[PDB]
mmCIF file of C-alpha atoms and ligand atoms in Angstrom:
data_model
loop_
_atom_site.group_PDB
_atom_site.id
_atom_site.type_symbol
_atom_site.label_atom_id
_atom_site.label_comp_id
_atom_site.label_asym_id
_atom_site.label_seq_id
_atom_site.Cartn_x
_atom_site.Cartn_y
_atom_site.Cartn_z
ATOM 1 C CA UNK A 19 0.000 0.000 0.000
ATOM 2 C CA UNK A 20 1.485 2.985 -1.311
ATOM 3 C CA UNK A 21 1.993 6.102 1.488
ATOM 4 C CA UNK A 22 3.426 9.272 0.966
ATOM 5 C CA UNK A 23 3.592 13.066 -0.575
ATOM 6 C CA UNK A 24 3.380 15.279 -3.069
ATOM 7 C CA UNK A 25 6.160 17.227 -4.404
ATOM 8 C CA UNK A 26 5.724 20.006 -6.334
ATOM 9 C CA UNK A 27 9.139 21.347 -7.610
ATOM 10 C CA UNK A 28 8.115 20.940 -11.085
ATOM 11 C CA UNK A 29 4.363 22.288 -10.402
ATOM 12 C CA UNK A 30 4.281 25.468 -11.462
ATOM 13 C CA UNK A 31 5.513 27.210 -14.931
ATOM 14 C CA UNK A 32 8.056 29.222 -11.774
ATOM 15 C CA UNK A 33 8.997 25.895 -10.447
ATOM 16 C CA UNK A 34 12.884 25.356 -10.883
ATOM 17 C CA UNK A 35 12.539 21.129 -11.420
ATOM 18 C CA UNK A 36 14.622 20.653 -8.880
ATOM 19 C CA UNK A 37 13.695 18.285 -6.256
ATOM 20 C CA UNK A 38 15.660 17.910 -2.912
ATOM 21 C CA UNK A 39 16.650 14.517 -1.895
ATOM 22 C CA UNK A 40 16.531 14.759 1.626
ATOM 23 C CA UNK A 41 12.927 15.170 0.914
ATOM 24 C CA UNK A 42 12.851 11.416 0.118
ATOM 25 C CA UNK A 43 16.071 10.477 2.750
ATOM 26 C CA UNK A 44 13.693 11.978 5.555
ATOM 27 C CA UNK A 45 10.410 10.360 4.181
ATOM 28 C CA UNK A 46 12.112 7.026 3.757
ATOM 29 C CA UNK A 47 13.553 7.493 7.548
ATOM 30 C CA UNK A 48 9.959 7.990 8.484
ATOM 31 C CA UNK A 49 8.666 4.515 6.736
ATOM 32 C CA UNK A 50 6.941 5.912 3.712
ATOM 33 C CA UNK A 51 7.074 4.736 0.620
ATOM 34 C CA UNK A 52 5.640 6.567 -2.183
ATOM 35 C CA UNK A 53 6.048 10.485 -3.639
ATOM 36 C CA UNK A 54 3.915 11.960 -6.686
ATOM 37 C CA UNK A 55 5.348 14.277 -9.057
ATOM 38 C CA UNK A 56 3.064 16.817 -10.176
ATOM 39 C CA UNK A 57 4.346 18.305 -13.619
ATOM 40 C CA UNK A 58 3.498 21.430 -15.631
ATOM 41 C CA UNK A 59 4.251 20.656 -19.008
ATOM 42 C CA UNK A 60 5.236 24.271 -19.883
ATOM 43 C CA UNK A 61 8.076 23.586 -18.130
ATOM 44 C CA UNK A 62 9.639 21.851 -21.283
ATOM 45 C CA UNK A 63 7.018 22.504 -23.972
ATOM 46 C CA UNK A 64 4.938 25.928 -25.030
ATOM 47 C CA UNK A 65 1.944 27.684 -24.293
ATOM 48 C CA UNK A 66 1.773 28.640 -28.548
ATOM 49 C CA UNK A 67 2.941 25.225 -29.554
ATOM 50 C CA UNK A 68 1.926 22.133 -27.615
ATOM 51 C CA UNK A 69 4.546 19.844 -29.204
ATOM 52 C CA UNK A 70 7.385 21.633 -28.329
ATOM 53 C CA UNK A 71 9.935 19.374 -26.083
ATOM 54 C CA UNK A 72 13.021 20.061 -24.425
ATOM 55 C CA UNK A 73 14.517 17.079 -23.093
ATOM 56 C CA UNK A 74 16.991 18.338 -21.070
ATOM 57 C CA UNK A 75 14.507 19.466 -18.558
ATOM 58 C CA UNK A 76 13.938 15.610 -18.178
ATOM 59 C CA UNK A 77 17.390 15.457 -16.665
ATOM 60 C CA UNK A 78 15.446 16.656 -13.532
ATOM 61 C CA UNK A 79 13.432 13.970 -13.215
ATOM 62 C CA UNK A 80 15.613 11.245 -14.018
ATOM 63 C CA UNK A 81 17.510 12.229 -10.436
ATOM 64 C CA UNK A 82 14.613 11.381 -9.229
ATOM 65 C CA UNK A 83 14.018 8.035 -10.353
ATOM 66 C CA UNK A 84 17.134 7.536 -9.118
ATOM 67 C CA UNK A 85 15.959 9.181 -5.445
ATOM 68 C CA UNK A 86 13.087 7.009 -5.601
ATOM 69 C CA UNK A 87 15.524 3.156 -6.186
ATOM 70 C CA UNK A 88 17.693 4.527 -3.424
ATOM 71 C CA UNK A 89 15.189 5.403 -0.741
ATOM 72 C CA UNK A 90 12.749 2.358 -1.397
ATOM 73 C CA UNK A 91 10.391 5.228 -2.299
ATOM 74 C CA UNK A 92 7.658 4.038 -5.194
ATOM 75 C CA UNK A 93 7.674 7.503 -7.911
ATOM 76 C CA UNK A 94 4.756 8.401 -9.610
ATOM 77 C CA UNK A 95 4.642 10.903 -12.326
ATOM 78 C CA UNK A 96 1.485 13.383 -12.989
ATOM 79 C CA UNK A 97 0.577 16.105 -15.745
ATOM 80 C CA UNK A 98 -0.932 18.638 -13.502
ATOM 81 C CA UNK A 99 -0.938 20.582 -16.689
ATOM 82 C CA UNK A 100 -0.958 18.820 -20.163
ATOM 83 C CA UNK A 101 -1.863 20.444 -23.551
ATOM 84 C CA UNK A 102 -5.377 21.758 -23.141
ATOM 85 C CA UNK A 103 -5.755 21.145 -19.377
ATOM 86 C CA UNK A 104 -5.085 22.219 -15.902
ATOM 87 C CA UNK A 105 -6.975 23.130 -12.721
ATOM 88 C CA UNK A 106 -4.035 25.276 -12.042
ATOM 89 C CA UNK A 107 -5.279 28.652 -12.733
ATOM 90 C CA UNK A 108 -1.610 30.157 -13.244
ATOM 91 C CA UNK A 109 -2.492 29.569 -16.443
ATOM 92 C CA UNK A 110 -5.272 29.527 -18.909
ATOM 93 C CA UNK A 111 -5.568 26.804 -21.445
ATOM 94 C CA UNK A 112 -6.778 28.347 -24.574
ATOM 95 C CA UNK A 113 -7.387 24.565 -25.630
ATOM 96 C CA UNK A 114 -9.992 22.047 -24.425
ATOM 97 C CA UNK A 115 -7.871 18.460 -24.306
ATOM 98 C CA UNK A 116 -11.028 16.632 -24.135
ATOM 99 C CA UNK A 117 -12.833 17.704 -27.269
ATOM 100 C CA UNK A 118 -9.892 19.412 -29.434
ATOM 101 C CA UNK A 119 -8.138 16.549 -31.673
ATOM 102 C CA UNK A 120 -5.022 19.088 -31.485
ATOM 103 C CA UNK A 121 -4.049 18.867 -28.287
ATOM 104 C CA UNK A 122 -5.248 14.829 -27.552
ATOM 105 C CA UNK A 123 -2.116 14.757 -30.556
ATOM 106 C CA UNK A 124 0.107 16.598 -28.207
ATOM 107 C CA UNK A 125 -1.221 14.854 -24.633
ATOM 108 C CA UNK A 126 -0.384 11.425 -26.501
ATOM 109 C CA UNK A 127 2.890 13.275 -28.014
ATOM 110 C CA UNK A 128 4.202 13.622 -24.611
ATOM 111 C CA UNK A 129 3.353 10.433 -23.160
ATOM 112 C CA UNK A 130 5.057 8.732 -25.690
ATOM 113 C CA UNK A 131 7.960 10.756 -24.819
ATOM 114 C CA UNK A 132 8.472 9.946 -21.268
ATOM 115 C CA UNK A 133 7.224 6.161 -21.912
ATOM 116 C CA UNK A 134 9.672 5.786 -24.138
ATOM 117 C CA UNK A 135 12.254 7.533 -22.346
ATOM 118 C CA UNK A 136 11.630 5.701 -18.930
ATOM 119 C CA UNK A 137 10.751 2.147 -20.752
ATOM 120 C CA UNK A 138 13.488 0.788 -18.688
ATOM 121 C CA UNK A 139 12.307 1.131 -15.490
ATOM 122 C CA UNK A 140 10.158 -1.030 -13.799
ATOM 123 C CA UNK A 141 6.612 -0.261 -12.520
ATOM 124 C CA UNK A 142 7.576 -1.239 -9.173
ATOM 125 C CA UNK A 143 9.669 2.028 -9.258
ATOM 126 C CA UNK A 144 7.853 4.191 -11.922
ATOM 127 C CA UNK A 145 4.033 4.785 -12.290
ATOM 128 C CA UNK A 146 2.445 7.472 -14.996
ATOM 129 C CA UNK A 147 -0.571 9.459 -13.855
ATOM 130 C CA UNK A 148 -1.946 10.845 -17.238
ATOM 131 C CA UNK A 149 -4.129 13.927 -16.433
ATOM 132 C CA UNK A 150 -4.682 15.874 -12.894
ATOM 133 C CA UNK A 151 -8.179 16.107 -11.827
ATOM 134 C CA UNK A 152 -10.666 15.925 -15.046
ATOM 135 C CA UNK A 153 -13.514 17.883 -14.131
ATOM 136 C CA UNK A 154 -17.529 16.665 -13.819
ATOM 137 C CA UNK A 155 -18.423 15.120 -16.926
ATOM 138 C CA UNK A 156 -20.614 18.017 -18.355
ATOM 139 C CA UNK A 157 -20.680 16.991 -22.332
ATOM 140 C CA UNK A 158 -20.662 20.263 -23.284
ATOM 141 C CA UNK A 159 -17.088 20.313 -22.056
ATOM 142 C CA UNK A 160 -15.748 16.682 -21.530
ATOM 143 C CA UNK A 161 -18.395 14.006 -21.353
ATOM 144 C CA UNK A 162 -17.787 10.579 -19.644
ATOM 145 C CA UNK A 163 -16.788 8.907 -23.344
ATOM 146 C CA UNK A 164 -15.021 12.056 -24.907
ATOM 147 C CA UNK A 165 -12.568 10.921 -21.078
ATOM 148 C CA UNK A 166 -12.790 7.617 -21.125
ATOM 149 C CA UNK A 167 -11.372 7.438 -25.327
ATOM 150 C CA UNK A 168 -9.189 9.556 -24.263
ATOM 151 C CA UNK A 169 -7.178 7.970 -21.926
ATOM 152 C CA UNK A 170 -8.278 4.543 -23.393
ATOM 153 C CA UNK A 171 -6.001 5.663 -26.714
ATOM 154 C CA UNK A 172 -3.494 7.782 -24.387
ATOM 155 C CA UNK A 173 -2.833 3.912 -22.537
ATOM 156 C CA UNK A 174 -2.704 2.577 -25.968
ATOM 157 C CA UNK A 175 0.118 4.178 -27.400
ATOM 158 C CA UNK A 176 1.907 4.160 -23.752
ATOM 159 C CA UNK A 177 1.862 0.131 -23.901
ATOM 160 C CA UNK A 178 2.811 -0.313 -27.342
ATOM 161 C CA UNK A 179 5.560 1.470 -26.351
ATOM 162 C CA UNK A 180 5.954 -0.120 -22.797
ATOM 163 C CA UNK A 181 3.250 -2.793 -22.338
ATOM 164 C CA UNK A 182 4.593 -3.561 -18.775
ATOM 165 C CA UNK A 183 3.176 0.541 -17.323
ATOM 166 C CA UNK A 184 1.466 0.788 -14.566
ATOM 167 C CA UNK A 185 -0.883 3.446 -15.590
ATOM 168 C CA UNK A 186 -3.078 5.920 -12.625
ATOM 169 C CA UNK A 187 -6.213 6.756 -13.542
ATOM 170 C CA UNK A 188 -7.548 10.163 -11.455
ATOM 171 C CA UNK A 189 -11.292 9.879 -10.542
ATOM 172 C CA UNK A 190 -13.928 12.235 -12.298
ATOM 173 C CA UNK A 191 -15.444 15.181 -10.469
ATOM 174 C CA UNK A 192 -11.780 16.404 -9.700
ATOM 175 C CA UNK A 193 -10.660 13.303 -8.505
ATOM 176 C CA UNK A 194 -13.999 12.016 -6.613
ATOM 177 C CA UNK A 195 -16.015 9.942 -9.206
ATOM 178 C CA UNK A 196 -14.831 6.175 -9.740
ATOM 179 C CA UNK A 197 -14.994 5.796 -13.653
ATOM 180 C CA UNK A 198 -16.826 2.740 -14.399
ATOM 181 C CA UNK A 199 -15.933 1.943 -18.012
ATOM 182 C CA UNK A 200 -12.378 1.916 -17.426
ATOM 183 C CA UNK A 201 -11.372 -1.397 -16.556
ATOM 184 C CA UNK A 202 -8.164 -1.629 -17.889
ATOM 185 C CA UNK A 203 -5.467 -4.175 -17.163
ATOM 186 C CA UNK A 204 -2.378 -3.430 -14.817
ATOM 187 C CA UNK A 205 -4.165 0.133 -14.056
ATOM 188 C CA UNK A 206 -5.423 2.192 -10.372
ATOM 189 C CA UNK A 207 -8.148 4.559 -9.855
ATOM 190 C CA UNK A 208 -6.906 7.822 -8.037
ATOM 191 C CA UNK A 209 -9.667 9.175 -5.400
ATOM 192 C CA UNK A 210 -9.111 12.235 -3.241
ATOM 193 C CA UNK A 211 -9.027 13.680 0.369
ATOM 194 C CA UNK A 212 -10.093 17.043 0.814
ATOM 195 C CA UNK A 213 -13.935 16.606 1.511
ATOM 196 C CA UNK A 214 -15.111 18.583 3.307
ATOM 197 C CA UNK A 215 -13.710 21.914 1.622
ATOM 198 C CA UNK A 216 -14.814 23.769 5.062
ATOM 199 C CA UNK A 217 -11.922 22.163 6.804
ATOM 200 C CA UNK A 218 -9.612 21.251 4.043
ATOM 201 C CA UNK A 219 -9.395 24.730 2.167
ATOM 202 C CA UNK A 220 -10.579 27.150 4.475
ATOM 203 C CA UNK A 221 -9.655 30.532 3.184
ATOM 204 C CA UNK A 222 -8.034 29.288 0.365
ATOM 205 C CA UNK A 223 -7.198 31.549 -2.198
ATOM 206 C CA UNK A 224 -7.405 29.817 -5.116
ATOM 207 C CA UNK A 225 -11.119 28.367 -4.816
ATOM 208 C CA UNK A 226 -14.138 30.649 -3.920
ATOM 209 C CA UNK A 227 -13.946 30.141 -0.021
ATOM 210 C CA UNK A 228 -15.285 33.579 0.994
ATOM 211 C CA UNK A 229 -18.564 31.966 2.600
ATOM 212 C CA UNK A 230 -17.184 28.167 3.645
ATOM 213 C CA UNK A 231 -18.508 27.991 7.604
ATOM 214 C CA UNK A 232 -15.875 28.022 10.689
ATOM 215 C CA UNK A 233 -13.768 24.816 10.417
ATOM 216 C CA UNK A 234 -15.387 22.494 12.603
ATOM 217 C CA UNK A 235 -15.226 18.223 12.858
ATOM 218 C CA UNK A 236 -17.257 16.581 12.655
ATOM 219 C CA UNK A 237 -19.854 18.172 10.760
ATOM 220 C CA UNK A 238 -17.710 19.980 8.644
ATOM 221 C CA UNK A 239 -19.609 21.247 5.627
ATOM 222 C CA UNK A 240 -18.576 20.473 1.679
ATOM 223 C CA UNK A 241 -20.559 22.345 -1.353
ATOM 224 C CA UNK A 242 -23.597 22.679 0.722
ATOM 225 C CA UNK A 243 -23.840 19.779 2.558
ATOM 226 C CA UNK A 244 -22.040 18.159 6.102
ATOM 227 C CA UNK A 245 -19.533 15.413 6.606
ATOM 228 C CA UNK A 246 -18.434 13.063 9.280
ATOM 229 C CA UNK A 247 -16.936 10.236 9.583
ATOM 230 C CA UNK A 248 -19.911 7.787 8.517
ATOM 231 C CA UNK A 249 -20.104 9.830 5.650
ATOM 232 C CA UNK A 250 -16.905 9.715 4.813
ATOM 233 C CA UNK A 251 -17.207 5.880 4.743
ATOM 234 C CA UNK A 252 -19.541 5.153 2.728
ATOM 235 C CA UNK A 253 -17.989 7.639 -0.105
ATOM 236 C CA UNK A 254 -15.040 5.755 0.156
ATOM 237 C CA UNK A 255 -16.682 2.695 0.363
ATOM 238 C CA UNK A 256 -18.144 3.328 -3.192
ATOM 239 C CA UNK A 257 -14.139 3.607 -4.369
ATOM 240 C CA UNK A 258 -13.087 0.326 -3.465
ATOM 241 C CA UNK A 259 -16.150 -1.108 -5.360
ATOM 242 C CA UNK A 260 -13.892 -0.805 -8.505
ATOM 243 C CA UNK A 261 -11.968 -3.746 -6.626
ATOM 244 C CA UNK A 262 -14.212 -6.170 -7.749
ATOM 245 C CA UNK A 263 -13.341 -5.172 -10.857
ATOM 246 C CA UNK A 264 -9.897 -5.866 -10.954
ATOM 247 C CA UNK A 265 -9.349 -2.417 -10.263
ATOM 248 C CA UNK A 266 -7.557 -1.116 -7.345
ATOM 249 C CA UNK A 267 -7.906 2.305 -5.987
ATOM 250 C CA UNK A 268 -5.514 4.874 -3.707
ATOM 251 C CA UNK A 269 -5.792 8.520 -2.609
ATOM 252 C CA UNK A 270 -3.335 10.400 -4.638
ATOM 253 C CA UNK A 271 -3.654 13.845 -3.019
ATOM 254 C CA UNK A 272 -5.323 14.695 0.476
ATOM 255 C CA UNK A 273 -4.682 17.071 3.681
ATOM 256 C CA UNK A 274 -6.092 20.139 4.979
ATOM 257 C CA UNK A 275 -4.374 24.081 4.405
ATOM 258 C CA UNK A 276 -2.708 26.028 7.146
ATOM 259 C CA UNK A 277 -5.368 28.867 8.079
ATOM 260 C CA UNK A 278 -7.861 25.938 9.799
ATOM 261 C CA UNK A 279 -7.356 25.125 13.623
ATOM 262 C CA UNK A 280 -5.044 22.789 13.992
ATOM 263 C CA UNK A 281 -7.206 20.649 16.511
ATOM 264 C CA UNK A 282 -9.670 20.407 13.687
ATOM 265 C CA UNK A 283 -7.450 19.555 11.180
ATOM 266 C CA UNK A 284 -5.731 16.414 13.605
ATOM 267 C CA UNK A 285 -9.329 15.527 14.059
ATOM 268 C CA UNK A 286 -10.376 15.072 10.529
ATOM 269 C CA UNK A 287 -7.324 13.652 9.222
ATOM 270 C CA UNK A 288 -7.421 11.074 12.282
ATOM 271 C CA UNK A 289 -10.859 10.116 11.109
ATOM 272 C CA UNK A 290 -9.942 9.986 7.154
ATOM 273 C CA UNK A 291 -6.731 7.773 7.851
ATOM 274 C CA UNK A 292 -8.901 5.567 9.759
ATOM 275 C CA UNK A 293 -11.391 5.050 7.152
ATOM 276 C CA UNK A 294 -7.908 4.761 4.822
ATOM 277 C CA UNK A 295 -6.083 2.042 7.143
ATOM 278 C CA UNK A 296 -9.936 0.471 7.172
ATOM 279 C CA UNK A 297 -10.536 0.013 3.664
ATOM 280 C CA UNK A 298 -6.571 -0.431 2.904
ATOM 281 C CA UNK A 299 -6.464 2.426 0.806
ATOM 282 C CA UNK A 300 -2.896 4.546 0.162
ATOM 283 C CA UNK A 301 -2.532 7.736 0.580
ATOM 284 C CA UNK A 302 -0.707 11.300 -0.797
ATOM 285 C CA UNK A 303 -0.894 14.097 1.421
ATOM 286 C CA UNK A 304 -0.639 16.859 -0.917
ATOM 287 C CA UNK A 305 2.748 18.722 0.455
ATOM 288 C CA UNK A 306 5.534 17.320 2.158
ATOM 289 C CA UNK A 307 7.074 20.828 2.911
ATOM 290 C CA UNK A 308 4.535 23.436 2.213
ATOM 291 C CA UNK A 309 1.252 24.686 3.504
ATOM 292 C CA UNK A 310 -0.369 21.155 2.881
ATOM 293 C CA UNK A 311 2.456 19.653 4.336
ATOM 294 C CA UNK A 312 4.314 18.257 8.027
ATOM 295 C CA UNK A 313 6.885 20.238 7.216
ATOM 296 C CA UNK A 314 7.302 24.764 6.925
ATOM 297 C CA UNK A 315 3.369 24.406 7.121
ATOM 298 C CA UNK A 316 3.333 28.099 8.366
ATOM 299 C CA UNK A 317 0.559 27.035 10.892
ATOM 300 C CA UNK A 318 0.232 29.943 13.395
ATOM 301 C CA UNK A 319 -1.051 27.319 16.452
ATOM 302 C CA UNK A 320 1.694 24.813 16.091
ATOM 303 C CA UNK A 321 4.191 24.038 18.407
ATOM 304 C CA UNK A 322 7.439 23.171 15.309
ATOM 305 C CA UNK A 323 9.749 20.901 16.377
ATOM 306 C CA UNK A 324 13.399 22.080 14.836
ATOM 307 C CA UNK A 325 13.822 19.544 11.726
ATOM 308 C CA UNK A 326 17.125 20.332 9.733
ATOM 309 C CA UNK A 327 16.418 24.258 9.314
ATOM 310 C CA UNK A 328 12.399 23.423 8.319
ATOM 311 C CA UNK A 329 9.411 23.507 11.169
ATOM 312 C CA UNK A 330 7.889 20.238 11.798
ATOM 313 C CA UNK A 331 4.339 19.051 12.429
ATOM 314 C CA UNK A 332 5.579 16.346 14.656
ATOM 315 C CA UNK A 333 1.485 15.363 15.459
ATOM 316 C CA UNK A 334 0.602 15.230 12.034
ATOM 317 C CA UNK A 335 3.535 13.312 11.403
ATOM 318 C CA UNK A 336 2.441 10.367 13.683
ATOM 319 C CA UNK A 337 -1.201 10.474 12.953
ATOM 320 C CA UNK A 338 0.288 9.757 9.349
ATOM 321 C CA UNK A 339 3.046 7.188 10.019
ATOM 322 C CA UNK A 340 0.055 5.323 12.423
ATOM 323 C CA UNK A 341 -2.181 4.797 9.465
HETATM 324 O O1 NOJ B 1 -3.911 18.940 -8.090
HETATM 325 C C1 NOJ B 1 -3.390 19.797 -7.083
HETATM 326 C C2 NOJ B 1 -4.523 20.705 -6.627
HETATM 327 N N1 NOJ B 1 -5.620 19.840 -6.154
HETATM 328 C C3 NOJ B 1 -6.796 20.635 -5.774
HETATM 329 C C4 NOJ B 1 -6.406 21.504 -4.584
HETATM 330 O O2 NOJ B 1 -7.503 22.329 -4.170
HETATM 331 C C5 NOJ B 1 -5.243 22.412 -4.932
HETATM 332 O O3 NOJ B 1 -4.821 23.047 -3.731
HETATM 333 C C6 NOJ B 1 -4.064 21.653 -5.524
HETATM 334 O O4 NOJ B 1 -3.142 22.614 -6.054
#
């Protein structure tokens, strides 16, 4: 069961690519076992031209493949932005991947690319994540099928180039909605853990949080309704349907931001990893150092212990090394 981070060095179209290994020497110390890689494709391509690729960027990641065999730490690699898509607002796509044959050319373009260029590393190491969060399947933007032949064809040309790739599927609805018609050999379903938004991204800046309630668990409140822990359960019991299947199914980004309480936040998360260790379902918490993170979280109510120069959450921590 895969347990771990996010790290987001190669995020954002400022990020520099380079990762720091004692991020994975420290996680490994602490008994995880698994880091996702984010990556905004602008970093080697173009916001004009799509099939632009530099390949020395790649250099970057290939230190941390390496990172990963050392540590006993499992890499998977993301596009958080891909030609025609991102939730990342830093951005705008003046492209729609899911309907626009264009940019499906270029998505596929630079899968092939890092398939081919990786094809010699096993999955146990090396996992590919094709697309960040896909949105709710409104058809006037990107319907269930215009997804599902997407990454159906995007898996396709992956394989023939690597047949062996373990291949992460992110859920619909940003990450929430299993996909039922994609039962696809040697592949994982990728839910999320932010509900509820009340506690998770209170005053966030980058969502509309002006009018979320006071954090508060349980009964924290997500897009009009309230959570707790039952709740919780049964949504995630839904996930693990795609089990039967064949299909298994992990959390690939979860955690709460730095401006909620942190007793609420060590309540939640407490309840979330027990429905996770319950179920057997791995976990991502979204930052390792940042303001999702157990490290330089920048939480005002925190006591830090001293961590090599960085402030760390030694209570979230545990909660997360317990589960
Ligand atoms: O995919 C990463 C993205 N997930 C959605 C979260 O709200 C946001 O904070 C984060 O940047």
């Amino acid at each position: 069961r895969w347990r771990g981070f996010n790290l987001l060095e190669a995020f954002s179209i400022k990020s520099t690519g380079n990762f720091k290994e004692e991020d994975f020497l420290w996680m490994a110390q602490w008994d995880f076992n698994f880091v996702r890689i984010p990556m905004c494709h602008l970093l080697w391509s173009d916001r004009g031209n799509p099939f632009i690729i530099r390949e020395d960027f790649f250099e970057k990641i290939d230190r941390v493949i390496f990172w990963g065999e050392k540590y006993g730490i499992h890499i998977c690699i993301s596009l958080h932005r891909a030609p025609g898509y991102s939730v990342n607002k830093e951005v705008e796509e003046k492209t729609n991947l899911w309907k626009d044959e264009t940019a499906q050319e270029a998505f596929i373009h630079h899968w092939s690319f890092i398939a081919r260029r990786y094809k010699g590393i096993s999955s146990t190491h090396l996992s590919f994540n094709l697309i960040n969060e896909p949105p709710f399947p409104d058809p006037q933007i990107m319907s269930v099928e215009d997804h599902n032949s997407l990454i159906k064809r995007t898996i396709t040309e992956i394989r023939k180039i690597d047949p062996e790739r373990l291949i992460i599927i992110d859920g619909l609805g940003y990450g929430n909605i299993p996909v039922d018609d994609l039962t696809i050999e040697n592949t994982v379903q990728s839910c999320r853990g932010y509900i509820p938004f009340s506690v998770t991204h209170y005053k966030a800046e980058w969502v509309d949080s002006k009018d979320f309630p006071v954090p508060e668990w349980p009964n924290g409140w997500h897009f009009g309704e309230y959570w707790n822990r039952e709740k919780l359960l049964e949504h995630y019991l839904t996930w693990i349907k795609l089990r039967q299947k064949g299909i298994e199914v992990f959390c690939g980004e979860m955690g709460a931001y730095n401006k909620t309480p942190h007793d609420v936040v060590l309540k939640w998360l407490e309840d979330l990893l027990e429905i996770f260790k319950t179920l057997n379902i791995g976990f991502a918490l979204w930052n390792f150092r940042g303001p999702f993170g157990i490290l330089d979280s920048e939480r005002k109510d925190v006591e830090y212990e001293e961590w090599y120069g960085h402030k760390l959450d030694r209570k979230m921590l545990e909660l997360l090394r317990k589960y």
